[PDB]
């Protein structure tokens, strides 16, 4: 009896992959400072983002199979090079460095004298600078060289731009949609009872860090434990905190900028003398707040590893500096902190057997992150003392392979892949394409 | 916006217009004022394939017996071999996601009946009926 009929706009979608753009909230543009991070032409966010709750719907999510992460990872990388392209290349800095020990803490800073090319191509320039031990390597008085010269090339980041992370909403073009998991407790895998859709994801600050998730989103109720493959010790374990942990990272060296002239037209910013406290960079963590968090987290691991077992913490095993330390950016400078003091503990079933804690931090201006070869970025010196306060919202953890599986387990801070950092914010999101076209049988026919 | 995807097909016909609107349109008019070689292609590649995917749907709507959006009907008889069912078992008791699942085998077959059996044979039929 019936007849086929074309319906346009039926609620049907399929899992797929597309190219997502950014959103800057249209305030970051007023923040100016000559293109801070991403935002230059970045899309103004809709003042009223739309979230539609889909009733009677259950969708299965996988955060580890999420494609939004891979795009974001490649975005930050592609974003990084484009910031370094118009800037000043430091290529003729590979000149021999004659260094000496600074006037305590085993001479971490080196005072280096070297020959340099002026605006004119005739006479050289005899000038001195100040580099950290991590930025230089001796070659055989004491003679040193740039640490990156044998490995790769080098370019200086522009002082105009800042590395300051600003909220970025990922949105989908016409024909696509983004699903949001509204459950309080979600490990990133399995069906989601309450699912809502949004045009743009929430505010996500692209904070690049290791061993500590900084400035992220807090969990709901109980703290969350996420891992791709849990029983497998080769896979990292992502943790999401409930209450934010106050962390202080400062540069207890009050510095000055030389702004030497290596023309024509180009000017390099050298590190002058340090006027102030003679100290190494340090990181503060409140003993009470970290412990309270640890006690709640250590109970969550026993929802898997069993109600009763011994869980011991220890600092990094070994590897590259990026893996073994906490790496991040504060005030333009790149800190590498020693987390060994926090991870020194041993816990009982429900308990573990002062007013402050500190963590020695090292500074490195010349960096190759993401295992990049051919391009090394020089972090320009900053006038005055840098102070910053951030939230610790999660960790990257690894489990030992030595077993003795039925006895006890030890966990250590992870590192390496930065995709895990983005999976922390993207676990509740995935991309699907909408299929509007549909057919249904009805009596209407036609004349 | 997709709210009835979990609901029955009968209830899903009421909010049909909302899906048509948002899916169909881009009206942000945001960005593209100041040029970039790098990222800009990325915000291009997405919306260019979007309008290509868009005109793709519009073609089927035109070449078939629709010539208009939302709902339109046709002279194609519903085959018994295609989801033999009860009328109340489809709209009232069944959902679109559940529905498209079964028709998956006959979907390409039905498409042929719309463009070939109708607008090729109907418009020619119309030309013969409009002469007299």
């Amino acid at each position, epitope marked *: 009896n019936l007849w086929v009929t074309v319906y346009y706009g039926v609620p049907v979608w*399929k*899992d797929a992959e597309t190219t997502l753009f950014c959103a800057s909230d249209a305030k970051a543009y007023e923040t100016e400072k000559h293109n801070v991070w991403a935002t230059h032409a970045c899309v103004p966010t809709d003042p009223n983002p739309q979230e539609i709750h889909l009733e009677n719907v*259950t*969708e*299965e999510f*996988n955060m580890w199979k999420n494609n939004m992460v891979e795009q974001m990872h490649t975005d930050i990388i592609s974003l990084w090079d484009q910031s370094l392209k118009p800037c000043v290349k430091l290529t003729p800095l590979c000149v021999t460095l004659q260094c000496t020990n600074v006037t305590d803490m085993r001479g971490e800073l080196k005072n280096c004298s070297f020959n340099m090319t002026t605006e004119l191509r005739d006479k050289k320039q005899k000038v001195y600078s100040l580099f950290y031990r991590l930025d230089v390597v001796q070659i055989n008085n004491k003679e040193y060289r740039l640490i990156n010269c044998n490995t790769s090339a080098i370019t200086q980041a522009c002082p105009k731009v800042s590395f300051e992370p600003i909220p970025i909403h990922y949105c989908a073009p016409a024909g696509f949609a983004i699903l949001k998991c509204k459950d309080k407790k979600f490990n990133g*895998t*399995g*069906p989601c009872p309450s699912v809502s859709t949004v045009q743009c994801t929430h505010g996500i600050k692209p904070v690049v860090s290791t061993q500590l998730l900084l400035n992220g989103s807090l969990a709901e109720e109980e703290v969350m434990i996420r891992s*791709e*493959n*849990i*029983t497998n010790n080769a896979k990292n374990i992502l943790v999401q905190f409930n209450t934010p942990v106050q962390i202080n990272c400062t540069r207890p060296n009050n510095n000055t900028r030389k702004s030497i002239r290596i023309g024509p037209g180009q000017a390099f910013y050298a590190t002058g003398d340090i006027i102030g406290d003679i100290r190494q960079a340090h990181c503060n963590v409140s003993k009470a707040t970290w412990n309270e968090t640890l006690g709640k987290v250590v109970k969550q*691991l026993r929802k*898997h*590893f*069993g109600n009763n077992t011994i869980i011991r913490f220890a600092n990094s095993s070994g590897g590259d500096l990026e893996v073994t330390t906490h790496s991040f950016n504060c005030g333009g400078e790149f800190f590498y902190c020693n987390t060994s003091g926090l991870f020194n503990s041993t816990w009982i079933s429900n308990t573990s057997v002062n007013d402050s804690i500190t963590l020695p931090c090292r500074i490195k201006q010349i960096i190759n992150m993401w295992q990049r070869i051919g391009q090394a970025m020089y972090a320009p010196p900053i006038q005055g003392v840098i102070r910053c306060v951030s939230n610790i919202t999660g960790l990257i953890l690894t*489990r030992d392979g030595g077993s003795t*599986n*039925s006895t006890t*387990e030890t966990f250590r801070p992870g590192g390496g892949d930065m995709r895990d950092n983005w999976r922390s914010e993207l676990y509740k999101y995935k991309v699907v394409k909408i299929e509007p076209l549909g057919v249904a049988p009805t009596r209407c026919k036609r004349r | 916006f997709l709210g009835a995807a979990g609901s029955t097909m009968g209830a899903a016909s009421m909010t049909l217009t909302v899906q048509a609107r948002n899916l169909l349109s881009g009206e942000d008019f945001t960005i593209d004022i100041p040029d970039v070689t790098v990222w800009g292609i990325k915000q291009l590649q997405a919306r260019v394939l979007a309008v290509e995917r868009y005109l793709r749907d519009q073609q089927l709507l035109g070449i078939w017996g629709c010539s208009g959006k939302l709902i339109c009907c046709t002279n194609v008889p519903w085959n018994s*071999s*295609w*989801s*033999n*069912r009860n009328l109340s078992e489809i709209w009232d008791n069944m959902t679109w*996601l*559940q529905w498209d*699942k*079964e*028709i*998956s*085998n006959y979907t390409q077959i039905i498409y042929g009946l719309l463009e070939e059996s109708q607008n090729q044979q109907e418009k020619n039929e119309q030309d013969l009926l409009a002469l007299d």
Partner: antibody, heavy 132, light 109 residues
Framework: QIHLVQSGTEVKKPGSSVTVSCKAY?????????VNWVRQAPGQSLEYIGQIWRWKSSASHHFRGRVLISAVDLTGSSPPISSLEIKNLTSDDTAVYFCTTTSTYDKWSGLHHDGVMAFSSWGQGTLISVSA | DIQMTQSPSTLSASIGDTVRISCRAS???????VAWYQQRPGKAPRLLIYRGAALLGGVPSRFSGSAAGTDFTLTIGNLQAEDFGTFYCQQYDTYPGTFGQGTKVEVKR
């Protein structure tokens, strides 16, 4: 890859209660994978008993309430494990029991049909002989 | 509750032959929700084809399914030694799933 390892051979007497366990190796979670319990009578065909899907236990109208299917997800010391219990054992229950699973992540896959599905991965099987 | 009928219960076929095993459901199954399994003696049954024609990855191209209305049939061309065993047809169309009588493919000589 995917490996389903069940318990050993159980010989149990009538009236008693039997519990078999299925260790699912290679499975990331039971959220993306539905577990179905199917038995096979000797010299006879296969019969569907029950299932657990989206952490919801279910069984055929034959075994309603008489069959109990429980499962726990991936832990830190072992893969995801499911267990099947049958109380009030009789002589007709002597069939060979199989632990099966299927990937439910693909929403438009032909493997599943709203709770009722095919079985991609099969276990080693467990024979239950009921005799006094 | 669907009842699946297979024919024949057992058959004799040689190597290289084209084997066709049919199946019929108590009612008409549309959307083609039907599965075919292979079981070698002493071994667990393996899934071959789902949705009646859709072959699983890792299965040779020699196997071909067909699904129309109440009548279903599985076609196996160029029969080989490893193919011999007991085959079952199953419908997941409605709750609960029910299998067929089974078909024993037996070596010819």
């Amino acid at each position: 890859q995917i490996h389903l390892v069940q318990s050993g051979t159980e010989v149990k007497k009538p009236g008693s209660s039997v519990t078999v366990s299925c260790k699912a190796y290679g499975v990331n979670t039971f959220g993306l994978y539905a577990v179905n319990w199917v038995r096979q009578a000797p010299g006879q065909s296969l019969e569907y008993i029950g299932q657990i899907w989206r952490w919801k236990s279910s069984a055929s109208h034959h075994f309603r309430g008489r069959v109990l299917i429980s499962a726990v997800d991936l832990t830190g010391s072992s893969p995801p494990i499911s267990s099947l219990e049958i109380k009030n054992l009789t002589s007709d229950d002597t069939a060979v029991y199989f632990c099966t699973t299927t990937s439910t992540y693909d929403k438009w896959s032909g493997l599943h049909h709203d709770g009722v599905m095919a079985f991609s991965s099969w276990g080693q099987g467990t024979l239950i002989s009921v005799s006094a | 509750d669907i009842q699946m009928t297979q024919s024949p219960s057992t058959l004799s076929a040689s190597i290289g032959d084209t084997v066709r095993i049919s199946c019929r459901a108590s009612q008409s199954i549309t959307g083609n929700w039907v599965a075919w399994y292979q079981q070698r003696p002493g071994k667990a049954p393996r899934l071959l084809i789902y949705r009646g024609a859709a072959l699983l990855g890792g299965v040779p191209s020699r196997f071909s399914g067909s699904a129309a209305g109440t009548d279903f049939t599985l076609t196996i061309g160029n029969l080989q030694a490893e193919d011999f065993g007991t085959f079952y047809c199953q419908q997941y169309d409605t709750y609960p799933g029910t299998f067929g009588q089974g078909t024993k493919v037996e070596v010819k000589r």
